[PDB]
Structures are given as C-alpha cells and as structure tokens.
Design a protein around this ligand. Sequence first.
Ligand code: HEM
Ligand code: HEM
Ligand code: HEM
Ligand code: HEM
Lengths: 146, 146, 141, 141
Amino acid sequence: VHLSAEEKEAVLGLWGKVNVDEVGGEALGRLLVVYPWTQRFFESFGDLSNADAVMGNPKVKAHGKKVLQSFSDGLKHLDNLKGTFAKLSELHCDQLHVDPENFRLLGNVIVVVLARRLGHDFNPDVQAAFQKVVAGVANALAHKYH
Amino acid sequence: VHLSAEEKEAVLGLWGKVNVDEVGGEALGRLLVVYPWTQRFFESFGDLSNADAVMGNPKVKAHGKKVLQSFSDGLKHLDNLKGTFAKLSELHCDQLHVDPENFRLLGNVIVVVLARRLGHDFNPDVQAAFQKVVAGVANALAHKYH
Amino acid sequence: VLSAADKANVKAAWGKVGGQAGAHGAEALERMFLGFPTTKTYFPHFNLSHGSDQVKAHGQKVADALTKAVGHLDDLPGALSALSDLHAHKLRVDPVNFKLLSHCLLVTLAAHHPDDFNPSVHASLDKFLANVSTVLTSKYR
Amino acid sequence: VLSAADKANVKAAWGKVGGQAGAHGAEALERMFLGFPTTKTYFPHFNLSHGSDQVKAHGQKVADALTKAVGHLDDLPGALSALSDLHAHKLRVDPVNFKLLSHCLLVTLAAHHPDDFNPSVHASLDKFLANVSTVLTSKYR
Ligand code: HEM
Ligand code: HEM
Ligand code: HEM
Ligand code: HEM
C-alpha cells in the first residue's frame, strides 16, 4: 500500500484504540447478517439462522478474533503484505474457494464496526488511510488465486 | 500471473492468430455501447450517440489498436506485469481517473471478441488461461491506485 | 431498464439460438467451471468432466428457465420467484457467480453466432442477463 | 420491494436521524472524496475542502433525496425519475461510485448513532441503498 508518513501514523495511532477481541467478533457476525451468502462457509458453526444468533455465536466471536489478529500482524508489515498473507490466500483460494469479492466486503464491514465503536476518532482522513490498508489486504489474500 | 507452461503456450499460440488491430477496434467499440458510462472518458471522439456511430468511428478504432497493442507487450512479460504496466497504471489513476473495475469489464469484452473471432479455437481450456491473463493485466493497471 | 429495443433484441437473438439452447447452457457452465474454479464449490454432487451428462442435463434446465424469462420480460419477478427462493434463500449462491455465468453465456453465444452477435445484441443480452441475475439474487433473508 | 421488516427498520432509523440528514450526507461525500479519489472528478466545479459550503449544501440535497425515497419506498422508481436520468444519461456516473457513497453513508451513520446501528438496521439500510442505487443506475440496464 502506499501510505504516507502522516497516514501510517494515523493508522497505527487509530489501532491502539481497537479492542481486538470485541471488534473482530462484531465484524464477522455483521458480515454473516448483512451478506447472507457468506453463511454458507461457516455453516459448521451452529445456528446462523437470524441476527441475534449469528451475533451471539461463540464460534463467530472466537473466529472474528483470529480474523482481526491477522489484520494486526499485517499492520506491522505494510511493505510486505503479500508475503505475510501468502499461506492464508492458499487457505482461502485452494481449500475454501472464497471468492475474492468477499475479502473486500469483510474489509468494509470492519471499516463500519470501527466507525461505530470510535465515533469522532474515525474521521474521514483516518478512514481514507484505512481504506488503502483494507484494499491491500484484500489483494494480498487474493494473490494465490490458482 | 502464476501461469503454467501449458497455458502460456496456449495463450501465445492463439494470440498469433488474432489480428490485434481489428479485435482492439472491436473491444473498445463494444465496451462503449455495452457499458455506456465508459463513454464519459471518451467525450472528444464525437458521435457516440448509437452503436453504428461508435463502431465505425475512426477515433474509437485508432485508439482501440493502441490498447490491444499494449495488451500484446503484456503477453510474454507475464512474469512482470506490474512493471510493464506501471506507466499506464499511474496514467489511469492519476490522469484519467478510471475506477479499476472497468479494467475487469474491458478484459472480459476482449475475451468475448476473441470468442467471436476465433470461434472453436477459443475453447473452454484456452478461455481459462486467458481469464488469468486479463485478471493479470487489470491487477497491474490497478497497482498504482492506492 | 430493459426498454423496447432490448426486449426486441432479446427475443430475436434467442430465436436464433433456437434448439441449441441447452447445448449453449452446458458449454457456458463448462466454461464457468474451467475459468473460475470457485463456482465448482456449489456442484460437489455433480460430475464435472468434459461433457458429463449431469452438466448437459443441468445445462438444459438453465436454458429453459432463460426461455421462460424471454417469454415473460415484463415480469421476470413472477416468472422466476421460485428460482429466486432456490438460489438466494436455499442454496445461498454468491451474487458474484451470476455475472460469471452471464459472462460465460455471452462468450458461448458469440463463439457460436459470431455473424449474429453484434454490438447492440451484445448490450441487450448483457442487460437481460443482469436483470435475470438481479431477480435470482433478491431473496437473501 | 424491501420486506416489511426492512421498510420498518429503514423508516425508524432514518426517522430518528432527523435533522442531521444534511450533515450526514455532507460527511458521506467527504469520506468518499478522501477515501476514493477517483470520485472527485464528477465535482471539479466544487471546492472539496473539509467544511466546504458547496459540499454542505449538496449534502443536504442528497439527504433530502433519500428522505423522499424513504417516504415512497414503493413509488421508488417514480419518485427518483429525474434523478435516474440525470445520473445515468446526463452525468454518466459509473455504477461502482454508488456502491462507494452507500459505504460512506453506512460509516457516517454508525459513527454518529452507534446505539441504533444494530446488525438488522445495518442490513435494512444496505438493501435500502442497493435498491436506491439500482433505480439510479437503471438507464444503463
Ligand atoms: C479480511 C480478510 C480476511 C482475513 C484477514 C481472514 C483471516 C482468516 C484466518 C486467520 C483464518 C484461520 C486459518 C486457519 O483456520 O488455519 C481464516 C479462516 C477462514 N476464513 Fe477468513 N479471513 C478473511 C476473509 C474471509 C472471508 C470474507 C470469508 C468468508 C466468505 C472467510 C472465510 C473463512 C473460513 C470458512 C475459514 C475457516 C474457519 C474455521 O476455522 O472454522 N474469510 N480466515
Ligand atoms: C486492460 C485495459 C486497458 C488498457 C491496457 C489500456 C491502455 C491504454 C493506452 C495504450 C492508452 C494510451 C496512453 C498514453 O500513452 O497516452 C490509454 C489511454 C486511455 N485509456 Fe486506456 N486502457 C485500459 C482500459 C481503459 C478503460 C476501461 C478506460 C475507460 C473507462 C480507459 C480510458 C482511457 C482514456 C480516456 C485514454 C485516453 C484516450 C485519449 O486519447 O483521449 N482505459 N489506455
Ligand atoms: C443465469 C442464472 C441462472 C439460472 C437461469 C439458473 C437456473 C437454475 C435452474 C433452472 C435450476 C434447476 C432446478 C430444477 O430442476 O428445478 C437451478 C439449480 C441450481 N443452480 Fe442455477 N441458475 C442460474 C445461476 C446459478 C449460478 C451462478 C450458480 C452457482 C455458481 C447456480 C447454482 C445452482 C445450483 C447449485 C443448483 C442446484 C443443482 C442441483 O439441481 O442439484 N445457478 N438453477
Ligand atoms: C447514491 C445516492 C445519490 C443520490 C440520492 C444523489 C442525489 C443527487 C441529487 C439530489 C442531486 C442534485 C440535483 C439537483 O437538484 O440539482 C445530485 C447531483 C449530482 N450528483 Fe448525485 N446522488 C447520488 C449519488 C451520486 C454519485 C455516487 C455520484 C458520483 C460520484 C454523484 C454525482 C452527482 C453530481 C456530479 C451531481 C451534480 C452536482 C452539481 O452540478 O451540483 N451522485 N445527486
């Protein structure tokens, strides 16, 4: 991603404010509530049959934590996003056959949970820095598309 | 793209049969009548008021040869599509303001014109190698985006 | 919004497919499975080798639903509302995959009717297929 | 159209936004200009600095158009007629820019109303903006 220095400070500054194990959970349940075709891929996770059931689901919460953790790792490797996400794009492509368009949709739902949780601190500038990162991670999880 | 030896041979072999100039005039006249918002960037070419005016327009045709001829340098240069296209990706991004999804729609319009012209040679297997290339090309023309 | 021009071209193009519809519908699925392997995830019960009878049979079913749509342009909602329920609601198929099949229907028709797939028929079929995909992707709930 | 649950969520959620409709449309356009710079080209006549007056004024016009459409959720095509032909025919706005503005309206609304943006409201407001975008992009298809 080409982040200036003012943008990288705005991203790492914003990220110290994130409760990783609250954000990731809320972002994977809304992905499942808001774009129902994604439910198909987590159906081994239980009752995803309505908003409160996705949102109250143990495995949705624990797996969202894992998802937002991968973001954190990737945040201290912005110059080498591809290589930090290479094994994970093999998981998503080869084994899971998740269409790349959904990497982008989960990227933007995490941008909505962050604005919901931080309010004024998730200003238009911070969002713009952060949209670049979400595009880079989306492209990095799609590099191994065999 | 990580393209296989079989597939390079398949793409190149068949590109030898396409008259790059007649297919580029065609791809571009069809993007502009199928996807009419792409005419916004080609306001100067004149009467784009119906598909007979578009097709047959000297300028759509002249320009089309040039995008297909750039497609050709990208072919066998596969290993390095990101530098072959870096000049044009910043040209698109910063000078013309073309949103990147239209790089996917022109790729697919070249693929139906190749299917229209080569017919049986453009079988499902050669198509599959080509969807990799056109994905490759768009991804490269999208690099300098953010 | 599918206007008169597009209605008239859908009918005529599809007229010229005629009885090859189900062949087209199968070539198109084969091209989809080959060009975008992620779609294959929905067919684990099918044999997806070169010209499987399962693929050719399903190919016929898609082409007959597209002919029902071609004879119901003013109201594909009604015409395809049980097919909406099956793909969005019941099989949950990704909206992205409908454009990938459309695109592959178009490469098939072009390849097979080249002196008949012209710019205006190309845009009419592409709005037709985009309107059929919209209807089958309505019921997510 | 929207299901009855969706209409009810859309109407209450946009109902309690109230007077802030203008301010949210303004901040939605700022977050799209900054976040997606290709969209700045439709506005060269404008001054696009944070707190610009033209951006504030045009932000009210966008929100008032979304209140007319929350008002007529079933007259949605008739209601947005002038605006579908002004966008597709006259301004030739690329389709994807409507998916980007819609994203910046859901981010603006989450930021200002954390309380109210529960997951179902979020789902009803996305289907509401995707169907508003389909009406505005309808001359293309
Ligand atoms: C923003 C991009 C994404 C990131 C950072 C991400 C990260 C991860 C990680 C850390 C794993 C665990 C790998 C393992 O089990 O060894 C994984 C698994 C998985 N992801 Fe994602 N993911 C992303 C997007 C998606 C999307 C959008 C889908 C949904 C269509 C998806 C579906 C899956 C599935 C099905 C699993 C397996 C879960 C399980 O263990 O039960 N992921 N992802
Ligand atoms: C894979 C697709 C594409 C390739 C390889 C490509 C290639 C080119 C090339 C060869 C030029 C000449 C640039 C120069 O050196 O001055 C150019 C110009 C241009 N391209 Fe593309 N392009 C692509 C897609 C697009 C799309 C889809 C749009 C429109 C929505 C676009 C809009 C333009 C415009 C406006 C020009 C300048 C036309 C003029 O001369 O006024 N390009 N492109
Ligand atoms: C152009 C739009 C499409 C049309 C017209 C369409 C139509 C149909 C029809 C007619 C059936 C047959 C059901 C019956 O026998 O009553 C069906 C089933 C099905 N469709 Fe589609 N379909 C379309 C797109 C898709 C896409 C894009 C996918 C996924 C990549 C898909 C996946 C399925 C699956 C998995 C089934 C069930 C297969 C089975 O019978 O076991 N369809 N479709
Ligand atoms: C999805 C929500 C949208 C709505 C409800 C909407 C609504 C409107 C309205 C009410 C006007 C004012 C017309 C008038 O009364 O003078 C307008 C103008 C315009 N809109 Fe949109 N719009 C939307 C999306 C877009 C998008 C995505 C773009 C492109 C990035 C865009 C670009 C414009 C431009 C260039 C004008 C003309 C501005 C001027 O000359 O002052 N709009 N829009």
